[PDB]
Amino acid sequence: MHTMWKGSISFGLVNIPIKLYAATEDKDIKLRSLHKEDHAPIKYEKVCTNCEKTLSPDEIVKGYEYVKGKYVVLTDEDLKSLKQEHEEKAVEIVDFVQLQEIDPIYFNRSYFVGPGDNGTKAYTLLREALRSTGKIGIANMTIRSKQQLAILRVYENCIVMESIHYPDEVRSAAQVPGVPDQSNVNDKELQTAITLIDELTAKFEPEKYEDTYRQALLQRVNDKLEN
Amino acid sequence: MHTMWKGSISFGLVNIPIKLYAATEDKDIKLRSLHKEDHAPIKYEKVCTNCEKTLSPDEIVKGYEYVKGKYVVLTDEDLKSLKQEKAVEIVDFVQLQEIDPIYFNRSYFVGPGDNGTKAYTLLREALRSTGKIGIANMTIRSKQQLAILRVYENCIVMESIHYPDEVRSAAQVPGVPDQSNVNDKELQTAITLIDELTAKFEPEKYEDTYRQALLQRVNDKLEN
Amino acid sequence: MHTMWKGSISFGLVNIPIKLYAATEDKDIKLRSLHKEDHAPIKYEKVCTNCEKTLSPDEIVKGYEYVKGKYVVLTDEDLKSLKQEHEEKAVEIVDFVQLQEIDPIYFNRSYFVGPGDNGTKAYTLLREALRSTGKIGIANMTIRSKQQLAILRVYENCIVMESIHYPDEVRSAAQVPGVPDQSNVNDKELQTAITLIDELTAKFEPEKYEDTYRQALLQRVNDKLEN
Amino acid sequence: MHTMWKGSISFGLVNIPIKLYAATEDKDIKLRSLHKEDHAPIKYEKVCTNCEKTLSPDEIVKGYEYVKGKYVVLTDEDLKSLKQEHEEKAVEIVDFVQLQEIDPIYFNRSYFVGPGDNGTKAYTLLREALRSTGKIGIANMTIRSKQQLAILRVYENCIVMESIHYPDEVRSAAQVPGVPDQSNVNDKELQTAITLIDELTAKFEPEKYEDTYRQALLQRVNDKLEN
DNA sequence: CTGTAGAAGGTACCTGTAGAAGGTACCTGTA
DNA sequence: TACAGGTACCTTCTACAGGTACCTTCTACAG
């Protein structure tokens, strides 16, 4: 695959050089906007709502909307001052917690972690330690000037780094309206449900599920192209 | 807390009325572009790149780019026909460990609907006992996609997932070694290290430092 | 300085990307042999002592002299198989001993260890740990296809990696002929010797000592060059 | 042990007859180049680059390369006048500094110093004075027609004289690229690193480390011989 | 309040490429 | 043992441009 990030997993004296690859790709069809009669691509042009004039990029400033219709203009220098840029590309591990402690509810984006230069032995040691102890590593990571939380876990023979939502962005499963909390299920009905589920149970065949809409749109495009 | 979808989980004769709630919210800081002269928000005008002129939404169409610079225009009629082909239709049940969290894309809590509680708890208990997840097809808003249904705590969680062709293979990751050449003493030392840094998960410990810094700076600027 | 080796310091899970620089340079004067009448450089021509013919580098093979006058030929395959090559450039630390356990008579060559890419925090941690515990690290390294033993220690603000002689190559000071034991030493004579040493004691001035032969040769060369 | 040098440590009125012994030996495997057709050793013939004529040692003169391609020819008389000859083989001590003032990065070669004829009491007095004052003696010495700097120190019951590099041939540890200061060190991380280093700490056992390449080559030679 | 898509700027990492010299490593000779 | 001289080399940095995948942000439409 294509490497998108070069750095190291650092927690104290440990510093394992690693590389990141995107674990998923967006195959959804993107449709360009074209003029009805000219059939040319459409471009976005910035125009002020008050001065009603075209604005160059140097005439645009960023402003945080603090109440409805009122903006505190954050100067560029302020924006760079808020960012705590790091000169060292490191997935700095801040904690190690049991795997069950963090639900896949938190997970946002998945990355494949591969060994870097002169870091295969430490990579294998960390992978085996994580698999044996059955836990994951909570870390802080920056890809391109951002800053987010991540968890490192083990999937098959690879290490997977999943960025996660911050704990205050994840809602509570105990606040869901109407969810029962009493384990008063009947044994006969439960057994019938289990039998039905087992009847519907099959194996996971990834080739069985396909994007039908994508294939249909591609076939329509091919038919219109040939005709 | 706020219902965003109201339908039913359906397979065969089983039809459980359910409601969907977003399991996560985006609290990232969003900034509005403004003019420097008058500090008014800006707006986007769609103009043609071949010849500059403002176009109404009724003056534009959608075209799929098949090669570089060449598009096939999909008329709204055929686009609607393709989009045609409120229930979460379960196709089959697989094991919990058969689908990795790298498949998961979006998370939703599932709550019982009107007169749909007994079936809801029956399905939840069956899924928990059998250790299975239900693969299904569903549409949120004019976009059909694939999802799974699992049990988290005492709730049902529906995770809309990526299609299998959209997920890369862990075997294709460059340079990843095999599980054959790990020393026992080094492994024990590494395990001891990991156990030393092991701590309980404290959700209040981790916070968005950049967002708090930006909010504090905004408050200070407002005071000034 | 000029980096001469790029790799990492590895012991178990710990990996520290580092760079090697030569701590010393040979400033001695080198003289080129020239023809007396032509003043042109000379060339080494390899000629067999028996066939009395000039040999191409593909007509020459290496041989070990197990006994005087007889050689066992070690072909390319044997030498390649004996020389174990590693896929990773690592200073594999095997031991951590006390600093005083290894005498400077073991030391052979000195190298300065600088932080590598994304390897500064771990470098600082290792330096501080070595300085505080008063320990050195025994390791195996290979600069250019020649495996040897080394020790990592702390000098001032830097980490210094010294290659060392193998223990079988170092003689024992207890077997030096004629060296007396800790026999009784006269206190007055020892005090007089101490006062003499203190009288001759001065501070270390690196500029005080210089290679006088090199300066004399350079001055003679310059004098002949001028006139 | 074989005496390789016989002289006296001299400073002012103090003159201590001494003998020098090599403190280390080169046990590396050396392979003789041989002709592949007859398995006879090869020899080097000095031939001129331009004239392409075989040159006897009386037709070869030394030359210093001040610029690339141009050589100032230094005749025998010039080189003899440049070299300083001493009628007495003496290690002439110039001053004494502390043990810690000269780093082992200066050290080049090691020799054991043994008492000479009727020079045991002075040897013991010098050893005791150097040990008690914690000092080393900087000196000028010539082994065989090459004057160099040396330091005299005490190791176990012996005196060790180390030929050392000139100060201009030793690089500065403050110019190592990327080396940081000691200000930013986390205490918890430092304690973790110290605990890890103590975990890998072991007593120095010289019998554990051996030149595996030499043993492998000797085993291969023995296998080829026995067959 | 949430889902959904489109356009736009940017740059990191890989790919394809080459020259120089500084320090490694080895071999002989030679008294 | 000392001591030097010649020889093959190759690694790291210097000097180098093109291209794509992925990040990241911003607005707008729907109900």
UniProtKB/Swiss-Prot annotation, chains A, C, D:
Entry protein name: Non-homologous end joining protein Ku
Annotated ranges, domain Ku: 9-193
Compartments where found: Spore core
Induction: Transcriptionally regulated by SpoVT and sigma-G factor.
Gene Ontology annotations of biological process type: DNA recombination; double-strand break repair via nonhomologous end joining
Keyword DNA repair set for record: yes
Gene Ontology molecular function: double-stranded DNA binding
UniProt function note: With LigD forms a non-homologous end joining (NHEJ) DNA repair enzyme, which repairs dsDNA breaks with reduced fidelity. Binds linear dsDNA with 5'- and 3'- overhangs but not closed circular dsDNA nor ssDNA. Recruits and stimulates the ligase activity of LigD. Probably involved in DNA repair during spore germination.
Chief place where the protein resides: other
Domain of life: Bacteria
Observed effect of gene inactivation: Stationary-phase cells lacking this gene are more sensitive to ionizing radiation. Growth rate, ultraviolet light and methyl-methanesulfonate sensitivities are unaffected. The spores formed are significantly more sensitive to dry heat, high vacuum-induced desiccation, X-rays and UV radiation, but no difference in hydrogen peroxide resistance exists.
Family recorded in the similarity comment: Belongs to the prokaryotic Ku family.
Self-association state and partner proteins as the record states: Homodimer. Interacts with LigD.
Shown segment, full-protein numbering: 18 to 244 of 311
Gene encoding the protein: ku
Keyword DNA repair: yes
Sorted UniProt keywords: DNA damage, DNA recombination, DNA repair, DNA-binding
